[PDB]
Amino acid sequence: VQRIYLDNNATTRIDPKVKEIMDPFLRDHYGNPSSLHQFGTETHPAIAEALDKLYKGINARDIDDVIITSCATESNNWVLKGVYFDECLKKGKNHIVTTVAEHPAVRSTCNFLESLGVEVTYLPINEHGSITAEQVREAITEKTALVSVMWANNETGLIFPIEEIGAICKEKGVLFHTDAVQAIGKIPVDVLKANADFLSFSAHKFHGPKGIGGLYIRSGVGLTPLFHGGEHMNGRRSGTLNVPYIVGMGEAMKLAVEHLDYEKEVVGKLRDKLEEALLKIPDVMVVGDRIHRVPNTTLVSVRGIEGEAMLWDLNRSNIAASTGSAHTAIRLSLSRFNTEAEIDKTIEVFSQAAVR
Amino acid sequence: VQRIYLDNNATTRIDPKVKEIMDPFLRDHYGNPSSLHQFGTETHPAIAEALDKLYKGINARDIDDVIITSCATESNNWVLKGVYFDECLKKGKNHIVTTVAEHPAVRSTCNFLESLGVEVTYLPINEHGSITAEQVREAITEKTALVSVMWANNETGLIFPIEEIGAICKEKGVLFHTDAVQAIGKIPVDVLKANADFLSFSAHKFHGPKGIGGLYIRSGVGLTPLFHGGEHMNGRRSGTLNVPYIVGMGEAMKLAVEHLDYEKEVVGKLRDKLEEALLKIPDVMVVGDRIHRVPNTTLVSVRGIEGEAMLWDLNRSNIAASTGSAHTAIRLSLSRFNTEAEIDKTIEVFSQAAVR
Ligand SMILES: Cc1ncc(COP(=O)(O)O)c(/C=N/[C@H](C(=O)O)C(C)(C)S)c1O
Ligand SMILES: Cc1ncc(COP(=O)(O)O)c(/C=N/[C@H](C(=O)O)C(C)(C)S)c1O
Ligand SMILES: [Cl-]
Ligand SMILES: [Cl-]
């Protein structure tokens, strides 16, 4: 069998250099970074270079934290539950603004915050398929604790106006969090440009293992731990370090940014080649704006064919894709690993499956 | 160089069968278990057998959860913060009882719960080096939400009276949590015998990777998520599955129990061989009871030599050990991998370092 992988917004294959760089921490360099003996101290240099690559990747500065969590889900839960006690209960600012595009755990966590009496404004998504920065302006009551807006949407591919929201946030003096999880590797990420207080990512969406992610925290800005115990990550997230994954995510991050041009030049081009052809066949439209999108994603609907049905069929010809809602549409999410071969084939296999 | 590893209460070497069983999930079986296509569905059987081994290892029953977390630290934070909203705020039972032996994150989390007005009784540790079940009895105000007692202590090796506390808890109708993290692999664990509502473990203390652990939850008993998003682990802990680690921890668990006799027969014997000799040289006593201890741990003090100083020196001769308080003492924590060779050598190297 020869399968075609087109589900990268949902997870990605660990890069071989990533797989390789981790291996020695699964073999012989197994000690606890916290221990003082040689087995501990050995791990130090490689953790440090890993972390370096992480800050380097998002343009964090030496005085900021990028804390290693066990996934973006953890990161996001930690921001929202954190600013709840720090700013909603204690500073009394009982409002958080966010969007409806936000992945479940963000929405879901907010939901639970309402259950404890938080006022949460869930910004509606427009016909262009986006949010506009001006919308965010409109919703910041000065008793607002936090704005949270995803950097790009995992369905549409659609990049939101993050740098602008950073401004609005700076100006209005409110805390800014962006879930960047579908931006890393797809387009450049600059926390500095973003006036982000808080930024989230998950390793597995840029060719690292599943089971690790990060939260960037701006220097000075504070966030009551979601994992108390305070023994690791300057006390901000206790619990023993996942050395292998950290070292991996480091490399993953590094490589992800190095391929940033290739993502735009080649992967985006492969996305347009796929999207062109598909769009040509009868009553098949792309959901949302086609202009401000991460390079690798396209979300198509075929009038009359349920998306769940299209996916089932595609699976049978060994092509892996997912569903985004619009009823439901097909989510085709490329990586640096797809070639034109696989694209051509996909267009063939799509079309034939369509008419049936 | 030929190094001797004696720090297993602080982390352990990933077993080669563990390392091996994971490898294909880092190579080619990389899909998201949640996806519906083949890349997702492939992972299913191996996750299932992994989970099987986990329940099998702690004697959980089909109707209980064993939820995959990203470490015991996560597990413990989740129990304590969970029962806080479920039983302290909502059912109004504003008391949690626990011990002073409990690892940091447990104590530390409780600490934060006091900051929100929880009444927490931190049971003192006796001269025998333990807790007595009767102590727990004494402290259960009927407005008590939870008792939390570690199964064995990570310093002394000392097993606490867990089955008895299970009784006391059942009788008094209060919620029971045991942090078992230093029991798995060292002695048999039975959640059933323990009338445990909640049980914690971390993979890396029994030859799995760091970065994964579990929380056992009894059927019916509920626990507001610490990771909202509700997409995974019957909604109880959202966030994408760390397939490799799960599959690994599975094997790790399996093997850990299979070696349970060998732990008692051989590793305990190696511990006594080491402990005997060390104890013989001038003014060196073992901290706490020597009788109800996990087989692999010994915690010695040498009057007049600081422990931190002994460790430094030992490190130089490529022997890795840690410190437990008593001022401070030496924590020597064996695994199934140590041989008599390494033990004899340790006694030599210890003694010589002592006189200096
Ligand atoms: C923007 C964004 N943020 C966080 C996540 C979750 O990553 P993780 O589950 O590994 O912590 C995701 C994962 N998204 C999956 C998807 O694209 O299908 C999910 C929405 C099912 S979690 C995401 O898209
Ligand atoms: C009983 C017990 N429970 C949980 C932990 C923490 O495991 P983890 O950091 O991997 O989540 C530990 C880890 N103990 C380390 C030790 O033995 O030195 C620690 C106390 C530094 S965290 C533990 O002993
Ligand atoms: Cl919290
Ligand atoms: Cl919570």
mmCIF file with all atom_site columns, N, CA, C and O in Angstrom, chain B residues 308-331:
data_model
loop_
_atom_site.group_PDB
_atom_site.id
_atom_site.type_symbol
_atom_site.label_atom_id
_atom_site.label_alt_id
_atom_site.label_comp_id
_atom_site.label_asym_id
_atom_site.label_entity_id
_atom_site.label_seq_id
_atom_site.pdbx_PDB_ins_code
_atom_site.Cartn_x
_atom_site.Cartn_y
_atom_site.Cartn_z
_atom_site.occupancy
_atom_site.B_iso_or_equiv
_atom_site.pdbx_formal_charge
_atom_site.auth_seq_id
_atom_site.auth_comp_id
_atom_site.auth_asym_id
_atom_site.auth_atom_id
_atom_site.pdbx_PDB_model_num
ATOM 1  N N  . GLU B 1 308 ? 24.441 16.010 51.618 1.00 0.00 ? 308 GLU B N  1
ATOM 2  C CA . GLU B 1 308 ? 24.727 16.679 50.360 1.00 0.00 ? 308 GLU B CA 1
ATOM 3  C C  . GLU B 1 308 ? 26.200 16.488 50.006 1.00 0.00 ? 308 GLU B C  1
ATOM 4  O O  . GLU B 1 308 ? 26.529 16.346 48.843 1.00 0.00 ? 308 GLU B O  1
ATOM 5  N N  . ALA B 1 309 ? 27.071 16.426 51.017 1.00 0.00 ? 309 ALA B N  1
ATOM 6  C CA . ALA B 1 309 ? 28.512 16.307 50.829 1.00 0.00 ? 309 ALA B CA 1
ATOM 7  C C  . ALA B 1 309 ? 28.886 14.885 50.394 1.00 0.00 ? 309 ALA B C  1
ATOM 8  O O  . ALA B 1 309 ? 29.705 14.702 49.497 1.00 0.00 ? 309 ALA B O  1
ATOM 9  N N  . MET B 1 310 ? 28.226 13.891 50.995 1.00 0.00 ? 310 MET B N  1
ATOM 10 C CA . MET B 1 310 ? 28.397 12.484 50.687 1.00 0.00 ? 310 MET B CA 1
ATOM 11 C C  . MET B 1 310 ? 28.002 12.196 49.240 1.00 0.00 ? 310 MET B C  1
ATOM 12 O O  . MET B 1 310 ? 28.602 11.342 48.596 1.00 0.00 ? 310 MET B O  1
ATOM 13 N N  . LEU B 1 311 ? 26.926 12.863 48.793 1.00 0.00 ? 311 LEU B N  1
ATOM 14 C CA . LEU B 1 311 ? 26.402 12.630 47.457 1.00 0.00 ? 311 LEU B CA 1
ATOM 15 C C  . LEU B 1 311 ? 27.368 13.174 46.432 1.00 0.00 ? 311 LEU B C  1
ATOM 16 O O  . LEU B 1 311 ? 27.557 12.519 45.405 1.00 0.00 ? 311 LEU B O  1
ATOM 17 N N  . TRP B 1 312 ? 27.852 14.404 46.677 1.00 0.00 ? 312 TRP B N  1
ATOM 18 C CA . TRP B 1 312 ? 28.787 15.074 45.782 1.00 0.00 ? 312 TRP B CA 1
ATOM 19 C C  . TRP B 1 312 ? 29.953 14.145 45.477 1.00 0.00 ? 312 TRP B C  1
ATOM 20 O O  . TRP B 1 312 ? 30.391 13.988 44.318 1.00 0.00 ? 312 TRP B O  1
ATOM 21 N N  . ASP B 1 313 ? 30.492 13.596 46.575 1.00 0.00 ? 313 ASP B N  1
ATOM 22 C CA . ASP B 1 313 ? 31.690 12.773 46.548 1.00 0.00 ? 313 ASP B CA 1
ATOM 23 C C  . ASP B 1 313 ? 31.422 11.482 45.757 1.00 0.00 ? 313 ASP B C  1
ATOM 24 O O  . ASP B 1 313 ? 32.187 11.134 44.835 1.00 0.00 ? 313 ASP B O  1
ATOM 25 N N  . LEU B 1 314 ? 30.301 10.814 46.098 1.00 0.00 ? 314 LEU B N  1
ATOM 26 C CA . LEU B 1 314 ? 29.824 9.603  45.449 1.00 0.00 ? 314 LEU B CA 1
ATOM 27 C C  . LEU B 1 314 ? 29.640 9.781  43.936 1.00 0.00 ? 314 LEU B C  1
ATOM 28 O O  . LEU B 1 314 ? 29.919 8.890  43.129 1.00 0.00 ? 314 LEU B O  1
ATOM 29 N N  . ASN B 1 315 ? 29.164 10.948 43.553 1.00 0.00 ? 315 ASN B N  1
ATOM 30 C CA . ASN B 1 315 ? 28.965 11.294 42.169 1.00 0.00 ? 315 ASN B CA 1
ATOM 31 C C  . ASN B 1 315 ? 30.278 11.191 41.397 1.00 0.00 ? 315 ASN B C  1
ATOM 32 O O  . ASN B 1 315 ? 30.306 10.687 40.270 1.00 0.00 ? 315 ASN B O  1
ATOM 33 N N  . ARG B 1 316 ? 31.351 11.672 42.044 1.00 0.00 ? 316 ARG B N  1
ATOM 34 C CA . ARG B 1 316 ? 32.703 11.721 41.512 1.00 0.00 ? 316 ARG B CA 1
ATOM 35 C C  . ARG B 1 316 ? 33.174 10.312 41.153 1.00 0.00 ? 316 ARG B C  1
ATOM 36 O O  . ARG B 1 316 ? 33.908 10.190 40.180 1.00 0.00 ? 316 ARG B O  1
ATOM 37 N N  . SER B 1 317 ? 32.769 9.278  41.916 1.00 0.00 ? 317 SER B N  1
ATOM 38 C CA . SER B 1 317 ? 33.107 7.888  41.614 1.00 0.00 ? 317 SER B CA 1
ATOM 39 C C  . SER B 1 317 ? 32.022 7.203  40.778 1.00 0.00 ? 317 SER B C  1
ATOM 40 O O  . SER B 1 317 ? 31.991 5.965  40.690 1.00 0.00 ? 317 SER B O  1
ATOM 41 N N  . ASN B 1 318 ? 31.148 8.038  40.184 1.00 0.00 ? 318 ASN B N  1
ATOM 42 C CA . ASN B 1 318 ? 30.153 7.686  39.183 1.00 0.00 ? 318 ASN B CA 1
ATOM 43 C C  . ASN B 1 318 ? 29.059 6.845  39.830 1.00 0.00 ? 318 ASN B C  1
ATOM 44 O O  . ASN B 1 318 ? 28.617 5.848  39.256 1.00 0.00 ? 318 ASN B O  1
ATOM 45 N N  . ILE B 1 319 ? 28.650 7.254  41.036 1.00 0.00 ? 319 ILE B N  1
ATOM 46 C CA . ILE B 1 319 ? 27.534 6.605  41.718 1.00 0.00 ? 319 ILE B CA 1
ATOM 47 C C  . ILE B 1 319 ? 26.452 7.636  42.037 1.00 0.00 ? 319 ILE B C  1
ATOM 48 O O  . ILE B 1 319 ? 26.736 8.666  42.648 1.00 0.00 ? 319 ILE B O  1
ATOM 49 N N  . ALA B 1 320 ? 25.216 7.360  41.587 1.00 0.00 ? 320 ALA B N  1
ATOM 50 C CA . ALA B 1 320 ? 24.132 8.336  41.572 1.00 0.00 ? 320 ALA B CA 1
ATOM 51 C C  . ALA B 1 320 ? 23.091 7.968  42.624 1.00 0.00 ? 320 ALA B C  1
ATOM 52 O O  . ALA B 1 320 ? 22.540 6.872  42.565 1.00 0.00 ? 320 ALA B O  1
ATOM 53 N N  . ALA B 1 321 ? 22.848 8.904  43.546 1.00 0.00 ? 321 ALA B N  1
ATOM 54 C CA . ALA B 1 321 ? 22.018 8.756  44.730 1.00 0.00 ? 321 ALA B CA 1
ATOM 55 C C  . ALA B 1 321 ? 21.458 10.133 45.065 1.00 0.00 ? 321 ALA B C  1
ATOM 56 O O  . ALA B 1 321 ? 21.880 11.117 44.462 1.00 0.00 ? 321 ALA B O  1
ATOM 57 N N  . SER B 1 322 ? 20.517 10.214 46.030 1.00 0.00 ? 322 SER B N  1
ATOM 58 C CA . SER B 1 322 ? 19.892 11.487 46.404 1.00 0.00 ? 322 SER B CA 1
ATOM 59 C C  . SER B 1 322 ? 19.784 11.638 47.920 1.00 0.00 ? 322 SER B C  1
ATOM 60 O O  . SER B 1 322 ? 20.148 10.733 48.678 1.00 0.00 ? 322 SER B O  1
ATOM 61 N N  . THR B 1 323 ? 19.183 12.768 48.335 1.00 0.00 ? 323 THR B N  1
ATOM 62 C CA . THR B 1 323 ? 19.088 13.193 49.722 1.00 0.00 ? 323 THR B CA 1
ATOM 63 C C  . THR B 1 323 ? 17.636 13.112 50.220 1.00 0.00 ? 323 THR B C  1
ATOM 64 O O  . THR B 1 323 ? 16.711 13.661 49.620 1.00 0.00 ? 323 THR B O  1
ATOM 65 N N  . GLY B 1 324 ? 17.448 12.469 51.374 1.00 0.00 ? 324 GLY B N  1
ATOM 66 C CA . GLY B 1 324 ? 16.246 12.671 52.173 1.00 0.00 ? 324 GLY B CA 1
ATOM 67 C C  . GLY B 1 324 ? 16.528 13.217 53.577 1.00 0.00 ? 324 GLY B C  1
ATOM 68 O O  . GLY B 1 324 ? 17.445 12.741 54.241 1.00 0.00 ? 324 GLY B O  1
ATOM 69 N N  . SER B 1 325 ? 15.689 14.157 54.063 1.00 0.00 ? 325 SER B N  1
ATOM 70 C CA . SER B 1 325 ? 15.861 14.820 55.366 1.00 0.00 ? 325 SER B CA 1
ATOM 71 C C  . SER B 1 325 ? 15.519 13.939 56.573 1.00 0.00 ? 325 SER B C  1
ATOM 72 O O  . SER B 1 325 ? 14.625 13.096 56.517 1.00 0.00 ? 325 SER B O  1
ATOM 73 N N  . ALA B 1 326 ? 16.218 14.222 57.688 1.00 0.00 ? 326 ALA B N  1
ATOM 74 C CA . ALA B 1 326 ? 16.163 13.494 58.948 1.00 0.00 ? 326 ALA B CA 1
ATOM 75 C C  . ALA B 1 326 ? 16.357 14.485 60.112 1.00 0.00 ? 326 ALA B C  1
ATOM 76 O O  . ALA B 1 326 ? 16.276 14.070 61.299 1.00 0.00 ? 326 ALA B O  1
ATOM 77 N N  . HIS B 1 327 ? 21.995 16.780 59.726 1.00 0.00 ? 327 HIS B N  1
ATOM 78 C CA . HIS B 1 327 ? 20.618 17.179 59.319 1.00 0.00 ? 327 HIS B CA 1
ATOM 79 C C  . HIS B 1 327 ? 20.049 16.220 58.254 1.00 0.00 ? 327 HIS B C  1
ATOM 80 O O  . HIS B 1 327 ? 19.150 15.446 58.590 1.00 0.00 ? 327 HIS B O  1
ATOM 81 N N  . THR B 1 328 ? 20.571 16.262 57.001 1.00 0.00 ? 328 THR B N  1
ATOM 82 C CA . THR B 1 328 ? 20.074 15.513 55.833 1.00 0.00 ? 328 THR B CA 1
ATOM 83 C C  . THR B 1 328 ? 20.812 14.172 55.594 1.00 0.00 ? 328 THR B C  1
ATOM 84 O O  . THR B 1 328 ? 21.998 14.011 55.917 1.00 0.00 ? 328 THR B O  1
ATOM 85 N N  . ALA B 1 329 ? 20.089 13.203 54.987 1.00 0.00 ? 329 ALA B N  1
ATOM 86 C CA . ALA B 1 329 ? 20.485 11.800 54.846 1.00 0.00 ? 329 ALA B CA 1
ATOM 87 C C  . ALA B 1 329 ? 20.607 11.400 53.372 1.00 0.00 ? 329 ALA B C  1
ATOM 88 O O  . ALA B 1 329 ? 20.281 12.199 52.490 1.00 0.00 ? 329 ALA B O  1
ATOM 89 N N  . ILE B 1 330 ? 21.081 10.168 53.127 1.00 0.00 ? 330 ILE B N  1
ATOM 90 C CA . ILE B 1 330 ? 21.400 9.697  51.785 1.00 0.00 ? 330 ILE B CA 1
ATOM 91 C C  . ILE B 1 330 ? 20.324 8.722  51.313 1.00 0.00 ? 330 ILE B C  1
ATOM 92 O O  . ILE B 1 330 ? 20.032 7.737  51.997 1.00 0.00 ? 330 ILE B O  1
ATOM 93 N N  . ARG B 1 331 ? 19.741 9.001  50.136 1.00 0.00 ? 331 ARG B N  1
ATOM 94 C CA . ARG B 1 331 ? 18.659 8.171  49.601 1.00 0.00 ? 331 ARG B CA 1
ATOM 95 C C  . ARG B 1 331 ? 19.155 7.220  48.485 1.00 0.00 ? 331 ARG B C  1
ATOM 96 O O  . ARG B 1 331 ? 19.481 7.635  47.364 1.00 0.00 ? 331 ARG B O  1
#
